From Swiss-Prot:
It is found in: Cell membrane; Endosome membrane. Coiled coil: none annotated. It comes from the Eukaryota. Disulfide bonds join C22-C108. Pfam families: UQ_con. One of its GO terms (biological process) is negative regulation of transcription by RNA polymerase II. The keyword Disulfide bond applies. This is Ubiquitin-conjugating enzyme E2 D3.
Length: 148
């Protein structure tokens, strides 16, 4: 019952100090499944887009990281077509000091500053590294098609 209690605490804190753009919480009786939304960051190719994510807390959260994946298609070196995310805090650098909130904001920093040297989609990493304007254009094209 430890996991459920921490999931309720994060929901309380989030509800009481709401972010202005992103959001997350339960969408049903099952507290271990959350939906989250982030806005494509202003000043990025993702601007105006709304990206949905699905979160599954494990039964020994917060000592193991939540499973977080996009359900909205997105063009990015570190996010693949199944929506899996390469972000170290979701893997090796997870800590119980971290929260869904800081995970979302971190994903936003990832969107604004990709890590092409550790990619999930090699072709997108290539384009990001060699032609940023093209990368930005395609990123914007996919935002308009899939996230708006």
């Amino acid at each position: 019952g430890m996991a459920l209690k921490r999931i309720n605490k994060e929901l309380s804190d989030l509800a009481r100090d709401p972010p202005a753009q992103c959001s997350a919480g339960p969408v049903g009786d099952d507290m271990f499944h959350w939906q989250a939304t982030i806005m494509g960051p202003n000043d990025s190719p993702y601007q105006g887009g709304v990206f949905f994510l699905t979160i599954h807390f494990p039964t020994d959260y917060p000592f193991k990281p939540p499973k977080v994946a996009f359900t909205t298609r997105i063009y990015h070196p570190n996010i693949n077509s199944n929506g899996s995310i390469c972000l170290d805090i979701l893997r090796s650098q997870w800590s119980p000091a971290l929260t869904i909130s800081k995970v979302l904001l971190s994903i936003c920093s990832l969107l604004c500053d990709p890590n092409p040297d550790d990619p999930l989609v090699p072709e997108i990493a290539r384009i990001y590294k060699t032609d940023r304007d093209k990368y930005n254009r395609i990123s914007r094209e996919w935002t308009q098609k899939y996230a708006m």
